[PDB]
Each structure stands twice: as structure tokens, then as C-alpha cells.
Design a protein around this nucleic acid. Structure first.
Ligand SMILES: [Mg+2]
Ligand SMILES: [Mg+2]
Ligand SMILES: [Mg+2]
Ligand SMILES: [Mg+2]
Ligand SMILES: [Mg+2]
Ligand SMILES: [Mg+2]
Ligand SMILES: [Mg+2]
Ligand SMILES: [Mg+2]
Ligand SMILES: [Mg+2]
Ligand SMILES: [Mg+2]
Ligand SMILES: [Mg+2]
Ligand SMILES: [Mg+2]
Ligand SMILES: [Mg+2]
Ligand SMILES: [Mg+2]
Ligand SMILES: [Mg+2]
Lengths: 252, 68, 117, 234
RNA sequence: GGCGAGCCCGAGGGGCUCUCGCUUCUGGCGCCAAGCGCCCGCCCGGCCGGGCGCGACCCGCUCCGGGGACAGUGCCAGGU
RNA sequence: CUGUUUAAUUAAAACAAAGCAUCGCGAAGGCCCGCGGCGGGUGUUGACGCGAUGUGAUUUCUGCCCAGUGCUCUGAAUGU
RNA sequence: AGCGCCGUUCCGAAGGGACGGGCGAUGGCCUCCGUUGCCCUCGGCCGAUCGAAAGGGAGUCGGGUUCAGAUCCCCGAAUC
């Protein structure tokens, strides 16, 4: 039959990210001599609003240790920073809010954000607004460190990758109901075309596996496995359970 | 004088004296480009029995294709 | 030699100047758009004739491959008269209409009587 | 003396900028540079077969200088003196009408086919085998062949230096076959040391395995772990 | 290397064994070397214009890290 | 609720909607495109994010059944 | 297999430029200047190129003229 709505996301025709008005990618300084054997002073000039993002962007200017040139970078603004604060970065930087430093320096229980999976990818984990990680379980030999992620997973990572100390500013963004379709329209028009949200039962049988019949009913078990082909994984994908929760996660 | 020795050494291309050179050449040619020019044949006996004569005009290319 | 930069680039080699052994067309091609081929037809209509009295300006029909400078040089090297300015338009039949305004020392009626329009 | 102050710059982290250092090991080298460098490193890392580990086990420079001083006056003739000898012999046989003015021309032979023919027919008195042939398959049969035919062979470093005694870019092989009257003792003095080095120890060299050398960072890591283990044991 | 500490022997001194550093009140500035030591053509023992080194330690065989004989690739076989 | 829809027979009780939920995924990943490459979309993105569905503002409720069909977890203790 | 296709910074030796100094040569009124050839030194392209007659984009306005032109033609007055 007809290609479903879920298969059109891979074409990239009209489902691309609205990426022009974004001010740039929010990354850290890549690791160098001044960030592996010391620290360097950096000044946050202003903080701006990246569209399609509720977390504020921070324009932190640096100084190149090798050539006479001021380098301007784009950090995720931690909570409580302000313009004119000397944001430090490196190995032996002192632990304050905003000072990105490797996890081997900080003690256990240090609430950080914008950390790295592998050392040198400029910030991947815990980047959304109002989220953080928990640093625990250091090791003298075999330099690894457990981090509790916002999903609750305890990931073992390296001890050389960096993380800005604090939480991401903009916490509580999902506290307000959108309260009308207009603000949702403006929000998704800012982010990307992720909003042809039409009910799969309400649409046609030839366009979705669930639609059809004289009544709006599913008719088929919506729990569909991970071994399903493309165009089949609709509804619940590899659902190990369903219904109302009981406990927190019950996953080791 | 030598080309029969080169032929008989190339025939048993599973032995240890040849498979090291074959592995080194496969790594070198894989880290090279796809289609380029080798300035001299790496198999002189096979090139000469296919028609290479060491004079001005005959060109040797080295080329990489995919299997399957 | 100390290579202080972490980027290796091309050395400035010695590029040779082109010094060929034989020419490739045996002769320079002659100028087909010469003075007799730029300015083709003087326009002798009413609106082109009234400009001679009221404008001190001649009207000519020019091939489309010529410009203001070539029209000016062609008029000065054929009619032995000075040119103040040249205004060109593309006539919609396919040719170029050139209004050649002359210097105030010359007389457009006298030049028109000498060229026969 | 009037003003002439000193203005020191402290090159630490977080202050006045770094000077232009050597930066040799950190420049982004091109594709073929990295190819040849990691190719040499790959030959150093991997275990080479015992028929090509014979290379880098070659002749020292004093005996190579003696060999070059012996081979300098057995040089093959170039085009200029070749045409000169042709025209001179033609003019002498046209004027004086001589039959055999030249008894024996002493000259060495070059080329792998010619050297292999001479060692198979036992005409070769000494074999000089080049080191830097990039297809080693062209060379690998020659040491065992010279060993079984009893002709002494010496492995030398540099095929360019052997090409410059034959007026060519590559020579790859030199066969000493004919000797003069004033060179027999010196050639025997060379052949005795060459048979001491290679022919009397071919069975020792063929059993040895080359390569198997780790990188210096890994060697220092294993040495640091060994010193830590020795500290823990004592 | 102590303007720094370390654990000891110990009379100066010794290194069993260890960690390097020279930027943390400030919305300032910071590059194209100061100094020192040698070598040249110029004013009879003087003056101008130039080169090298120390400043900025030496050597080395991967740009640096993270995985690693796994992942993937080519073919064959069985499920779905 | 405002909005949208069968242009050329329907304007709706239909669709959408905020709210309430559920499931997958910590990047060698989830869902997809591609005949092909470790090629692309989400991704200038990182669980307050992305992807897939049910219901449809607020208040009050979410009863009982895993026998069946699905989805998921575990162990070469164990049949094929 | 292939016309060709993927991709736009990715796996590229992807700057042909100028300043300053030194040396050799040529020319003009060889006083004084302009070039050629070599050496040293410096120099991220966010990567060739296209893409708006409504986006960015320096500077012309007044009177008169024809059957048909007008900030364009004539006169006068300005600017880049
Ligand atoms: Mg809630
Ligand atoms: Mg919804
Ligand atoms: Mg809906
Ligand atoms: Mg319908
Ligand atoms: Mg169907
Ligand atoms: Mg039913
Ligand atoms: Mg050639
Ligand atoms: Mg109607
Ligand atoms: Mg609730
Ligand atoms: Mg409700
Ligand atoms: Mg129920
Ligand atoms: Mg354009
Ligand atoms: Mg304009
Ligand atoms: Mg009009
Ligand atoms: Mg006007």
C-alpha cells in the first residue's frame, strides 16, 4: 500500500530541522594542553536564546594560548552564571558553578551537566534544560567513573572526559501547560516539522496498519516487536509491559 | 634466468614467505586510492607474459574493486 | 628548516611560462568589425531628421556587437568630426540605433549635407 | 647601560603566548608520507619471514668500501667510451689489419637473470646482492641458490650505489666472475670474510626470526608494569 | 630545580620511594623577543648594516585519546 | 472551545487541538531513507530530547479477568 | 556493469597573494625611478561556482520637448 507517515522521516524532504535561525552548535572547547595540564580564564560576554531550545546559550570568549586571537565559543549556560563571570576551564580548575573540568578531579556526588561520553566530543550527555548527572564510584586503577543520568541509568564512563559543574539553566520548562494549539504551533514551527500528529486509527487502512473498520478501533495488538519490518513498527514498539505503572523502573 | 623462480615462488601463494608480503601489499594498496598509476609492475614475470616490455609507452595502473 | 605550523601545504614550485614552438593559426585574424562595418546605415526618417536641426545629433544604424567607444572611434575616423556623446538603443527589428551628438564646433546640417542625407 | 632593561616572558599556562616550537611530530603529514612512515613502522612491528629477515643483516661499511674499491676498476663501459672503443678498434683493424688485438676483456656482469645464469653454471666467483629492492620476491631466491651452488654472496645496503658503478639507476646484482692478475689475492681476502659471514652461517640465519618489536610507548608501559611488579614482590 | 613540601638513614650528605609549579577578589592589556654569548665588510684601535645559539632541555617508531581480533565487510545456512 | 477538511453533490456529531497516559532509545543507540559506501533524516540534536500510538478541555471516577492472540525477561538445567 | 550517482567539508600536498630585506639583469632624461628571476618572512578557505528585476547594495534632481520618449532627449543645477 501507501508509504506511511513514519517512513517519510528518512527522506529528509520536508522533515528537516528548522536550522537557519539557530545561532550555532552548543559545544565545549576541544581538549588541548591548557585543558589537560592546567586551566585558562574565559569570560562570558552574553547569553542568548537559541531557537528550538529552551536551554540558554552562553557566548563565552576565550584567549588562544598559541596565537594572538580571542576565540569565541558557544557554551550551554549553567544555572546562576552571569555576564562578566570568569568561567574557568581545565583539569585543575577550582570547583564552582560554570567551571567545566574532568570528572576525575571532582569528588563523588558532584552534580554536573553537559558531560561527555568519550573524551573529546565536546559535550553530549545531559544537555536539555534543567537536567543533570550524578558523579559517583571513582577508581584508582582502570580509570572509570559511574554517572547517574537523567533517565536513571548508571553509565560507566572514562575519568578524563569533562563536564560543566551545575545544572542546565531553564529548569521547569514543562511546568506550564501549552494551554492552546497556538503556542504548540509556534513551538513546533520553531523546532522542526514534527507535527503531522494524526491518529493512526483515524487515518486510512492503506496508509497505516491500524486504521479502518466502521468503528474507530485498532483491531490488532499494538505491542509490536523490535524484529518488525519497516512500516510495521507502529503503536507500542517492543513494549515489555503496558498500563498503569507500579514501582519506579524495576530494571537492573 | 630468474622469471621461472619468480613464477614458482608466486604459485605457492599460501606459504609464509609470500603471505607476509601479500598482507603488507594489501594494506598498502587498501590505504592507497582506488585508481592510480604504478610506475613499474610489482609482478614482472606475469606482466611480461601478459605483454609488458620495459620501454617508453607501456603504462601500469593499479585498481581496486569490491568483492561480492 | 623548522616547520612551526601544524599544517603542511604545497611548496611554491617553478611554473614555466608558455613558450610554444609553432603558432596555432598561422596569422592574426583580421578585424571583421572595422570602421566600415560598425556604422552601417544613417537613418533618414522624420524623427531622425529633426534631431539634426534641433539636437546637433546624427542618427545611425549600428551592428549589435559594437559599443559606445567603437561607435565614437568609427565616427571620428571616418567622418573626421568630433563626438560629444553616443546614446545607443536596440531597435526592435534587430539592429542598434545610435544617437551621436557632436561637438559644438561642428554643424550637424553641414555634416549631413556632406554625407548626403 | 643607559636604559637597556630586560623584559622576560613567562611561558606558562594562562599567560603570555607560547613561542614557535619545532612542531615536527605534530604537523598533519600527507597521505603518501603517512603511507611510507607507517609502512616502515609496520615492517618494524610485524614478524617478517626468515627469508627476508636476512635484510638489515648486511655488510659493514669498511668491507663495503673495500668491495667498492675492488669493483671500481671492473666498471662496465658507458656509451661514450663504448663508441670510442668501437671506432678505435675499427680504425686499427682497417689500418694495421690486425686479427686479435684484444685477448681478454675483464668486466663484471649485471642483472638478475645474468647473475642467476652464472651461479647456475658456476661461473660466478662472487655475488653482490642489493638490499633496497621493494619487491623482495625478485631477490629472495638468490641467497639459497648461491648457498647451494657454493658461490659466495654478500648483502649490501643501497642499490643506488650499485647502480652508480654500472651507470644506471638500479643494478640489484653484481657478479664477479673474471679476475685480473693483480686482484686475485684481494678478491680471495674478500671471499674469505664473505664466506665467514654468510655462507658458514646461512643455517643459523635461516632459523632466526626478525621483527616482533613493539612500539616504544608500549615498551615503556611494559617496563613500568615490570618495575611495579618488582616493587610489589620486593 | 627549592622560592616548595614529603617517609627515613644521617655529621656534612645520601634517594629506599614519591607529586611537579610557577594563570583564582576585579567585564583592562598581552603576537611579530628583551638580555646574554660567538662570527663578517666599515672608522687604528672607534662607528653603521647583517648571520647563529641560549632564552623556548635531549631522544624517540604511530597527531592525540577511546574500542579492538571483537564490531563490521563478502558469501552460505536457519528463523521472523 | 478558536482552527481545518471531501476544489466540481456533504463543513459535520468528521479531522486537528492543549490536557491525561503508555512504549523504545545513554549515540557501535531508538524510529526511518537509500541499488551502493560505516552514505543520510531526526542531528547546529542528548531523557524537561527524539521517535510511535490510545484518548481528547475542567470536576469525579480508570471496576474485575494473562484462559486466548500479541509484546517482553531468564537460564546450553532442559526436547527440537 | 553503466550513462552516471552519493557528499559539500568529509579520508585532499585543495593560499600562485602582498609587505619588508638582500642579490643579478633590463629600460626611460641611467640624477631619480619602474619591472624581471632567486632566497627569507607573513598570510584557516568555514572551502570552486550559481542562487532575489519586492532582501543587502555609493551616487539626478527642476523646467521644456513628440503623433509615439522621459529621473534617459535639450537647458540649468548637483553627486558618487
Ligand atoms: Mg505531568
Ligand atoms: Mg498528542
Ligand atoms: Mg489527532
Ligand atoms: Mg476516513
Ligand atoms: Mg497494510
Ligand atoms: Mg471485535
Ligand atoms: Mg616510465
Ligand atoms: Mg458544501
Ligand atoms: Mg494528574
Ligand atoms: Mg479529560
Ligand atoms: Mg480498564
Ligand atoms: Mg549572484
Ligand atoms: Mg541602485
Ligand atoms: Mg509614456
Ligand atoms: Mg526632470
Amino acid at each position: 500500500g501507501r508509504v506511511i507517515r513514519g517512513q517519510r522521516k528518512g527522506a529528509g524532504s520536508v522533515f528537516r530541522a528548522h536550522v537557519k535561525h539557530r545561532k550555532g552548535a552548543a559545544r565545549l572547547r576541544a581538549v588541548d594542553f591548557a585543558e589537560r595540564h592546567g586551566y585558562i580564564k574565559g569570560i562570558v560576554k552574553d547569553i542568548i536564546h537559541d531557537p528550538g531550545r529552551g536551554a540558554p546559550l552562553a557566548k563565552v570568549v576565550f584567549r588562544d594560548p598559541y596565537r594572538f586571537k580571542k576565540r569565541t565559543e558557544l557554551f550551554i549556560a549553567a544555572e546562576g552564571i552571569h555576564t562578566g563571570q570568569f568561567v574557568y576551564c581545565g583539569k585543575k580548575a577550582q570547583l564552582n558553578i560554570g567551571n567545566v573540568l574532568p570528572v576525575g578531579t571532582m569528588p563523588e556526588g558532584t552534580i554536573v551537566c553537559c558531560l561527555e561520553e568519550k573524551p573529546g566530543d565536546r559535550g553530549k550527555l545531559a544537555r536539555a534544560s534543567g537536567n543533570y548527572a550524578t558523579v559517583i564510584s571513582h577508581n584508582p586503577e582502570t580509570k572509570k567513573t559511574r554517572v547517574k543520568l537523567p533517565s536513571g541509568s548508571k553509565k560507566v564512563i572514562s575519568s578524563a572526559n569533562r563536564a560543566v559543574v551545575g545544572v542546565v539553566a531553564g529548569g521547569g520548562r514543562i511546568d506550564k501547560p501549552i494551554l492552546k494549539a497556538g503556542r504548540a504551533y509556534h513551538k513546533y514551527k520553531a523546532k522542526r516539522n514534527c507535527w503531522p500528529r494524526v491518529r493512526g486509527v483515524a487515518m486510512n487502512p492503506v496508509e497505516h496498519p491500524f486504521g479502518g473498520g466502521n468503528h474507530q478501533h485498532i483491531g490488532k495488538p499494538s505491542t509490536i516487536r523490535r524484529d518488525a519490518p519497516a512500516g510495521r513498527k507502529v503503536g507500542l514498539i517492543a513494549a515489555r509491559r503496558t498500563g498503569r505503572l507500579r514501582g519506579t523502573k524495576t530494571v537492573q | 634466468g630468474a622469471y621461472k623462480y619468480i613464477q614458482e615462488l608466486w604459485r605457492k601463494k599460501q606459504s609464509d614467505v609470500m603471505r607476509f608480503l601479500l598482507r603488507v601489499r594489501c594494506w598498502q594498496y587498501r590505504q592507497l586510492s582506488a585508481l592510480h598509476r604504478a610506475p613499474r609492475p610489482t609482478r614482472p614475470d606475469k606482466a611480461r607474459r601478459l605483454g609488458y616490455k620495459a620501454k617508453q609507452g607501456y603504462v601500469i595502473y593499479r585498481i581496486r574493486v569490491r568483492r561480492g | 628548516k623548522i616547520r612551526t605550523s601544524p599544517t603542511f601545504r604545497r611548496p611554491k614550485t617553478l611554473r614555466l611560462r608558455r613558450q610554444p614552438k609553432y603558432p596555432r593559426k598561422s596569422a592574426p585574424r583580421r578585424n571583421k568589425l572595422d570602421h566600415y562595418a560598425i556604422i552601417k546605415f544613417p537613418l533618414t526618417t522624420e524623427s531622425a531628421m529633426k534631431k539634426i536641426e534641433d539636437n546637433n545629433t546624427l542618427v545611425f544604424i549600428v551592428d549589435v556587437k559594437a559599443n559606445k567607444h567603437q561607435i565614437k572611434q568609427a565616427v571620428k575616423k571616418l567622418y573626421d568630426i568630433d563626438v560629444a556623446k553616443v546614446n545607443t538603443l536596440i531597435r526592435p527589428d534587430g539592429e542598434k540605433k545610435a544617437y551621436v551628438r557632436l561637438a559644438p564646433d561642428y554643424d550637424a546640417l553641414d555634416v549631413a549635407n556632406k554625407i548626403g542625407i | 647601560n643607559p636604559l637597556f632593561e630586560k623584559r622576560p616572558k613567562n611561558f606558562g599556562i594562562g599567560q603570555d603566548i607560547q613561542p614557535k616550537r619545532d612542531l615536527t611530530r605534530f604537523v598533519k603529514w600527507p597521505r603518501y608520507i603517512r603511507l611510507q612512515r607507517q609502512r616502515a613502522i609496520l615492517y618494524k612491528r610485524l614478524k617478517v619471514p626468515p627469508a627476508i629477515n636476512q635484510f638489515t643483516q648486511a655488510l659493514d661499511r669498511q668491507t663495503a668500501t673495500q668491495l667498492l674499491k675492488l669493483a671500481h676498476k671492473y666498471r662496465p663501459e658507458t656509451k661514450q667510451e663504448k663508441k670510442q672503443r668501437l671506432l678505435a678498434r675499427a680504425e686499427k683493424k682497417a689500418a694495421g689489419k690486425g686479427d686479435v688485438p684484444t685477448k681478454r676483456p675483464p668486466v663484471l656482469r649485471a642483472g638478475v637473470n645474468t647473475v642467476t645464469t652464472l651461479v647456475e653454471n658456476k661461473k660466478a666467483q662472487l655475488v653482490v646482492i642489493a638490499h633496497d629492492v621493494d619487491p623482495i620476491e625478485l631477490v629472495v631466491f638468490l641467497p639459497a641458490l648461491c648457498r647451494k651452488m657454493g658461490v659466495p654472496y654478500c648483502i649490501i645496503k643501497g642499490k643506488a650505489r650499485l647502480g652508480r658503478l654500472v651507470h644506471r639507476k638500479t643494478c640489484t646484482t653484481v657478479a664477479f666472475t673474471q679476475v685480473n692478475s693483480e686482484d686475485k689475492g684481494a678478491l680471495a681476502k674478500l671471499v674469505e670474510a664473505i664466506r665467514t659471514n654468510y655462507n658458514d652461517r646461512y643455517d643459523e640465519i635461516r632459523r632466526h626470526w626478525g621483527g616482533n618489536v613493539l612500539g616504544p610507548k608500549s615498551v615503556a608501559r611494559i617496563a613500568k608494569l615490570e618495575k611495579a611488579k618488582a616493587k610489589e614482590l620486593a
